[PDB]
Design a protein around this ligand. Structure first.
Ligand SMILES: [Mg+2]
Ligand SMILES: [Mg+2]
Length: 351
């Protein structure tokens, strides 16, 4: 026979039961059928891929859109799953009305200093009310909060988003303080970013968090998105990242793991899953082998490992592939293939 289906094989989360959670990013429409069966069997943690983004929850001020998020929370409750929150504060996927002043124009264009002072106050109050409302609604279900997301610039230093331009670093400080205030002492507060294995980006995040902890900001851990590929980044750079934040007393979580077949950008994407050579899936399986062995080796410092999807048929990497190959092209980043059959990678992380 072929490779067995994902619902026929040993559960991933059971395999790592004593080491870290195994999670999946989900949409509300994935909660029935085989996807739900796979989720129930293989994962003990969830995160909303899109339904808890700031623009998804409050697309207009005071107009709350809970339906899709609530459906995911309900599934997590029913199947006793952990739940990460994605995300409270982010330069992206955040409704434009946050940064619009009382005259309808963008806050970053103001030049009067007392008006600027007033805008920073208004923006922080809106942020604080968004966080309060969400955390009050979901505090009994969420077990890890991505309080801020992607605040470090890849060029170096802090990302100079509109959050930064109006408030400096105070949006980060106020975001963690608010989540702690309304989530209580037991809420687990994370700063999440991508390319945290890149040493210079790793150091910028380390320096920010160390400073913030010294000022008493309540930060419990670092989220490593881990949007990686068969070729990058090195195991050694991954270990160094995990270890440097552990040295700060911080938890680590792998939050958005997927392993692209392609470099960046994913030029020359395969157009059909049948065209992908088995050489590539074997390279992917070797990669995942070393990666989860590193995770196991470091398992006392890593509380949770989340994939950014379930199986290869649904992944934002397909969007990116089509974006860089004129509308066509496909990626295959998980341990379950687009027909829900296990891949070489599955066997190498279940051992
Ligand atoms: Mg652990
Ligand atoms: Mg292995």
């Amino acid at each position: 026979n072929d490779q067995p289906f994902a619902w026929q094989v040993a559960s991933l989360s059971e395999r790592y039961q004593e080491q870290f959670d195994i999670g999946a990013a989900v949409e509300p429409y994935q909660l029935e059928g085989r996807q739900a069966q796979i989720l129930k069997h293989h994962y003990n943690s969830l995160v909303a891929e899109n339904a808890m983004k700031p623009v998804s929850l409050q697309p207009r001020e005071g107009e709350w859109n809970w339906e899709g998020a609530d459906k995911i929370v309900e599934f997590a409750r029913k199947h006793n799953m952990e739940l990460r929150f994605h995300t409270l504060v982010w330069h992206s996927q955040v409704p434009e009305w946050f940064f619009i002043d009382e005259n309808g124009n963008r806050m970053v264009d103001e030049t009067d200093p007392e008006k600027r002072k007033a805008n920073k106050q208004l923006l922080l109050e809106r942020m604080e009310n968004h966080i309060k409302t969400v955390v009050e609604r979901y505090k009994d279900d969420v077990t890890s909060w991505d309080v801020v997301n992607e605040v470090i610039d890849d060029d170096g230093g802090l990302r100079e988003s509109e959050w930064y331009q109006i408030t400096g670093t105070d949006y980060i400080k106020v975001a963690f303080e608010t989540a702690r205030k309304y989530g209580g002492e037991e809420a687990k507060l994370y700063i999440n970013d991508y390319n945290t294995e890149n040493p210079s980006k790793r150091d910028d995040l380390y320096n920010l968090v160390k400073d913030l902890l010294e000022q008493g900001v309540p930060i419990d851990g670092v989220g490593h998105q881990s949007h990686i590929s068969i070729g990058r980044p090195s195991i050694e750079d991954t270990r160094a990242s995990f270890e440097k934040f552990t040295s700060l007393g911080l938890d680590n979580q792998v939050t958005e793991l997927d392993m692209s077949l392609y470099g960046w950008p994913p030029t020359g994407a395969y157009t059909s899953y049948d065209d992908i050579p088995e050489e590539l899936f074997q390279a992917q399986a070797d990669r995942y082998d070393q990666l989860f062995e590193l995770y196991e080796e470091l398992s006392a410092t890593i509380s949770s490992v989340t994939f950014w999807g379930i199986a290869d048929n649904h992944t934002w990497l397909d969007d990116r592939a089509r974006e860089y190959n004129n509308g066509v092209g496909v990626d295959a980043p998980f341990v379950f293939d687009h027909n829900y059959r296990v891949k070489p990678a599955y066997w190498r992380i279940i051992d």
